[PDB]
């Protein structure tokens, strides 16, 4: 990627996956790869987008 | 016969007959209690923003 920006649409600290973050990116190649959070701050739903 | 309560009533009431009742007396205020179930609360991202 290059020049990617993350905004939080929904944010509710519920027990399920209750938060929506829409990452506005600009990619050189169009292909799937993996997202991850290193901390224990958030737990992502899917492994790749 | 001093005139009826239809013409002399304070706050602009409207006295009627077959049940003895007054109408539309603009006085006081009605409080309200809403016990709303949790199903009606739609999430944020299902509405425009």
């Amino acid at each position: 990627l290059s020049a990617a920006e993350c905004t939080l649409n929904e944010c509710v600290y519920s027990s399920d996956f209750g938060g929506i973050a829409t990452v506005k990116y600009s990619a050189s190649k169009s292909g799937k790869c993996a997202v991850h959070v290193p901390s224990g701050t958030a737990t992502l739903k899917e492994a790749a987008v | 016969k001093a005139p009826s309560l239809k013409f002399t009533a304070p706050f602009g009431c409207e006295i009627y007959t077959n049940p003895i009742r007054a109408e539309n007396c603009a006085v006081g205020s009605i409080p309200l209690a809403f016990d709303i179930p949790d199903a009606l609360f739609t999430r944020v991202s299902e509405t425009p923003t």
Side-chain angles (χ1 to χ4, degrees), chain B residues 31-42:
Chain B
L32 289 161
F34 293 92
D35 194 359
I36 302 168
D38 298 332
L40 274 73
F41 289 102
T42 308

Side-chain angles (χ1 to χ4, degrees), chain B residues 3-28:
Chain B
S4 300
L5 201 60
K6 187 169 88 272
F7 304 111
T8 63
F11 297 95
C13 298
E14 299 172 359
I15 309 301
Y16 285 107
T17 173
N18 283 316
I20 292 171
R21 67 192 188 274
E23 300 290 333
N24 298 316
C25 303
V27 62

Side-chain angles (χ1 to χ4, degrees), chain A residues 3-47:
Chain A
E5 183 180 1
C6 177
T7 63
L8 275 73
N9 295 321
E10 289 182 353
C11 194
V12 168
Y13 57 102
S14 68
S15 181
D16 57 353
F17 300 102
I20 295 172
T22 301
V23 175
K24 185 177 180 180
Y25 64 94
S26 295
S28 67
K29 294 192 288 181
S30 66
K32 62 182 286 186
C33 65
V35 296
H36 181 74
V37 179
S39 298
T41 300
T43 301
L44 297 176
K45 182 177 180 181
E46 66 270 16

